């Protein structure tokens, strides 16, 4: 994995030694070169994971998250270069440094062979995210949002530290490859109950779990566009990655510990989606949609059937692409009206037709239109949870109604109807913005041709 | 109720609006033109019966029970004109009513496609921006203290002035673009 | 489809409908005949004139605009303003 970590670190001299007008073009070019290089991780086998060293390996779960992560950096650089154009050159280089450093932490978070190194990188991802939100966020509430984002994650994860060090003392190792073969069944006790909670609640917060999700409609909304892209597209999916790693060590206790949390998700996706029907802030509507979509990933990991893991990792990759594009579309209208009120700018298909078509495609992938990998993940999770209990389809199916309802209302409020009269600074769509939308949507639609690469280690 | 100039509906205006709505809902009930013609003259006779009532209390009472009469006897799906609010073609072409300022954001390769149109548009924008300060100082010298009482706007007073707040009435899009 | 109106055509059709009204003599009617003060018509008759204009040209005049059309010239001007004629 050292053929990826070293170019990501060489992106630091590539942004701090660049000419003052070349610091976006060079970082975009070489980050796209790293993203083209990321395809070598697709050397996956049906039996063995691509095991590099004592420190790094990459199975078919971590590989699509890595390719999405290394792809997301050029898209964040294209997204965040317009509103940081009047910024000081040193703070501009510091912003690019925080994005590069966050990618650097993420690519060795997903390839951590050992779990306490996973913890160190997993909590290392807080600090560039916290600095990006609380420094380049636009409104007043970025400080409070950074506080909530920091202290939900740390309060969930400092018991995870004690739990992982307890596994290191008990089993002898926190290598995942060793613990595939030295896993002991976890019996029923209160000690093993709080063992389970300490191993799970950090990732429950990072997914987020319903009831614990209060950081997210502040952290995703008060962030800048690159912060919202990396928080929605990757940093939620650390929780699903970590749960899929750590429920190896939590059997058969998960079979009766998952019962409340599944309820919290199966009801939570009914609530948060319903919250999306009454959100006046468009960016908050996309945030609660992200909560509603990650509730299915929580359910699928907690029922721990193969169809559920295949659908959950397909839903993670698909929601990363779709939610990143929806935040970028909301930014494309925020850079024209300078407000996030959804009812303010209306009728935008009369003025911006191709950008309305990008809104249309992002809304159709949001509502899981087949054969998108959104629908492949959604459908496979629904199959596995019908196998879990035959009544859950009601909570699934009603969700698939409400998920349609706000996905098109967002399309009807913003793009359709009569245009707002007094708003006259609606510029034509830049080539940069349509490039951003196309680089989100075209990989998402190409993955419908060959979806087996985003279906996880048990395809 | 809700009018831009008047703060209310007078009794005479309420009687006229009830008369128009009664004839329209009756015509919805009375599809054919001769049958509607007969019953519309009968309804005109009913309106011309109590025409000369001088007691405003008694007249308001008669208007109120006539509204009760109408609400009991209205068509459930009345006739609506196509471009009328509730019709089948109402606000249909609002997706083609592009505002004028979008023409300011064209590329020069498509502005040069219409040279006379934009060369004629520049003097519209010129006339607008040199009429603007005169009509603003017209509005702030004629409006009473405490704000304008009604939503009515004054006309132009001089020979050379344009009427105040005129641009989004003159340069509104056509109803069939 | 949808033949474009003119001011002369709207004027001819408005005065055509008003000549077909038995309470108006077609030898006195001009474009500037006030209905209440020159033709001596009732307010109910003015409402019926506006409704015949609606049935003639195929669109609804609202009440706040119906009550302020007191001559055929203002009716022709209102239909000109709502149909954008002489474009």
């Amino acid at each position: 994995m050292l053929k990826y970590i070293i170019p990501t670190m060489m992106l630091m001299p590539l942004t701090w030694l660049s000419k003052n007008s070349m610091i976006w073009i060079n970082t975009t070019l070489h980050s796209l070169l790293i993203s083209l290089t990321s395809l070598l991780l697709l050397n996956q086998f049906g039996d063995n994971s691509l095991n590099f060293s004592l420190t790094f390996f990459s199975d078919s779960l971590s590989t699509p998250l890595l390719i999405l992560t290394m792809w997301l950096l050029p898209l964040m650089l294209m997204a965040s270069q317009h509103h940081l154009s009047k910024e000081n050159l040193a703070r501009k280089k510091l912003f690019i440094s925080m994005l590069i450093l966050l990618q650097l932490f993420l690519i060795m978070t997903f390839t951590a062979t050992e779990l306490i190194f996973f913890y160190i990188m997993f909590e290392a991802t807080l600090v560039p995210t916290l600095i990006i939100i609380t420094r380049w966020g636009n409104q007043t509430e970025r400080l409070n949002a950074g506080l909530y984002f920091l202290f939900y994650t740390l309060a969930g994860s400092l018991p995870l530290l004690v739990a992982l060090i307890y596994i290191q003392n008990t089993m002898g190792s926190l290598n995942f490859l060793i613990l595939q073969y030295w896993v002991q069944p976890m019996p029923n006790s209160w000690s093993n109950t709080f063992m389970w909670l300490a191993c799970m609640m950090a990732f429950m917060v990072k997914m987020p779990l319903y009831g614990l999700h209060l950081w997210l409609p502040k952290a995703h909304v008060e962030a800048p566009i690159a912060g919202s892209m990396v928080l929605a597209a990757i940093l939620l999916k650390l929780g699903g990655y970590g749960m899929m790693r750590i429920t190896l060590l939590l059997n058969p206790i998960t079979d009766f510990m998952a019962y409340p949390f599944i309820m919290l998700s199966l009801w939570g996706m009914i609530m948060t989606s319903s919250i999306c029907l009454r959100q006046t802030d468009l960016k908050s509507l996309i945030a609660y949609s992200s909560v509603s979509h990650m509730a299915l990933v929580i359910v699928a990991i907690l029922i721990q059937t193969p169809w559920s893991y295949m659908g959950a990792t397909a839903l993670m990759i698909a929601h990363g692409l779709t939610s990143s594009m929806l935040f970028c579309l909301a930014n494309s209208n925020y850079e024209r009206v300078h407000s996030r009120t959804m009812i303010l700018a209306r009728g935008l298909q009369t003025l911006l037709p191709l950008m309305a078509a990008w809104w249309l495609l992002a809304s159709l992938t949001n509502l899981a239109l087949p054969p998108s990998i959104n629908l492949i993940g959604e459908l496979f999770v629904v199959m596995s949870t019908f196998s879990w209990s035959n009544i859950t389809i009601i909570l699934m199916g009603l969700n698939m109604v409400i998920t349609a309802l706000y996905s098109l209302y967002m399309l009807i409020t913003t793009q359709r109807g009569k245009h707002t009269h007094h708003i006259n600074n609606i510029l034509p769509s830049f080539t940069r913005e349509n490039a951003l939308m196309s680089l989100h949507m075209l990989p998402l639609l190409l993955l419908s041709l060959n979806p087996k690469i985003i279906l996880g280690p048990l395809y | 109720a809700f009018l831009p100039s008047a703060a209310y509906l007078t009794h005479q205006q309420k009687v006229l609006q009830l008369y128009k709505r009664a004839l329209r809902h009756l015509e919805s009930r009375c599809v054919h033109r001769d049958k509607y013609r007969y019953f519309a003259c009968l309804l005109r006779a009913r309106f011309d019966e109590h025409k000369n009532e001088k007691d405003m209390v008694k007249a308001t009472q008669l208007l109120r029970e006539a509204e009760k009469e109408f609400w009991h006897g209205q068509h459930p799906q009345p006739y609506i004109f196509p471009e009328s609010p509730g019709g089948t073609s109402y606000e249909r072409y609002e997706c083609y009513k592009v505002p004028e300022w979008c023409l300011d954001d064209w590329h020069p390769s498509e502005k040069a496609m219409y040279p006379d149109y934009f060369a004629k548009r520049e003097q519209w924008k010129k006339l607008r921006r040199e009429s603007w300060e005169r009509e603003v100082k017209q509005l702030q010298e004629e409006t009473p203290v405490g704000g304008p009482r009604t939503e009515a706007l004054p006309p132009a007073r001089k020979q050379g002035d344009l009427p105040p707040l005129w641009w989004h009435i003159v340069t509104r899009p056509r109803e069939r673009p | 489809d949808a033949p474009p109106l003119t001011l002369e055509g709207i004027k001819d059709r408005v005065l055509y409908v008003l000549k077909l009204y038995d309470k108006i003599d077609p030898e006195k009617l001009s474009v500037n005949s006030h209905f209440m003060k020159d033709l001596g018509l009732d307010s109910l008759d003015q409402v019926e004139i506006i409704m015949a204009m609606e049935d003639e040209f195929g669109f609804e005049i609202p009440d706040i605009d119906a009550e302020k059309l007191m001559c055929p010239q203002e009716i022709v001007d209102y239909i000109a303003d709502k149909k954008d004629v002489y474009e």
Binding site: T350, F430 | V98 | -
Partner: peptide, 13 residues
């Protein structure tokens, strides 16, 4: 013959 200018946004970009 009495062709009217159709106002539309900038489709160049």
């Amino acid at each position: 013959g009495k062709r009217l200018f159709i106002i539309k946004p900038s489709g160049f970009y």
